[PDB]
């Protein structure tokens, strides 16, 4: 349920749950994505930006 909102559309962008998470966890302040990412269910239209932050090296 809660992770649905960070994979159903993010799939077609290639940002695949299990395989994104190694990239993300390289940053020691970004740990608790478990429940705190669920705002993504309504936040879509300005949540689109979130993955720009480190993309140069992340992607």
């Amino acid at each position: 349920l809660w992770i649905a909102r960070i994979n159903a559309a993010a799939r077609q962008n290639g940002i695949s749950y299990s395989k994104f998470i190694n990239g993300l966890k390289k940053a020691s302040v970004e740990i608790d994505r478990k429940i705190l990412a669920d705002i993504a269910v309504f936040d879509k239209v300005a949540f689109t930006a979130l993955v720009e932050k480190a993309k140069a090296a992340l992607a």
């Binding site: 349920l1 649905a4 159903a8 559309a9 799939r11």
Partner: protein, 140 residues
């Protein structure tokens, strides 16, 4: 305050022409379950009570990719264990849209529980653009 989402009856149905029929059949007949439940529409109740409406188009194209196709049987013996048996195989039975060679979800919701109310919501009308007997409003 709850994280749960019952009924939901059925709030997300995603009306889709399953064109994957034959040309990558045994990849996505395995996961028509996880579609009715999930992978896009997973955002509400991905385990309990729900319904879906996927759009059928052809049936006798199973493709299936192995020696299995011309020597794997199916059995029902519907009365008194049958006695006298049956021995037709997969590309010979698929000629008929029946109950075992065409739904797939038979084997993935595999007993009847949770499946007991969602048998023909996908219509199983078969015969291409000549047989679009599905939803009049705009399917994807």
């Amino acid at each position: 305050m709850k994280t749960f989402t019952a009924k939901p009856e059925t709030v997300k149905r995603d009306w889709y022409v399953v064109d994957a029929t034959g040309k990558t059949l045994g990849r996505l007949a395995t996961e028509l379950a996880r579609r009715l439940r999930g992978k896009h529409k997973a955002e509400y109740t991905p385990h309990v009570d729900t319904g879906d409406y996927i759009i059928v188009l052809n049936a006798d194209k199973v493709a299936v990719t192995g020696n299995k196709r011309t020597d794997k049987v199916y059995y029902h013996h519907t009365g008194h264990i049958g006695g006298i048996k049956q021995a037709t195989f997969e590309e010979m039975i698929a000629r008929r849209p029946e109950r075992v060679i065409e739904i797939a979800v038979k084997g993935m919701l595999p007993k009847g529980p949770l499946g007991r109310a969602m048998f023909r919501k996908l219509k199983v009308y078969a015969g291409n653009e000549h047989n679009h007997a599905a939803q009049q409003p705009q399917v994807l």
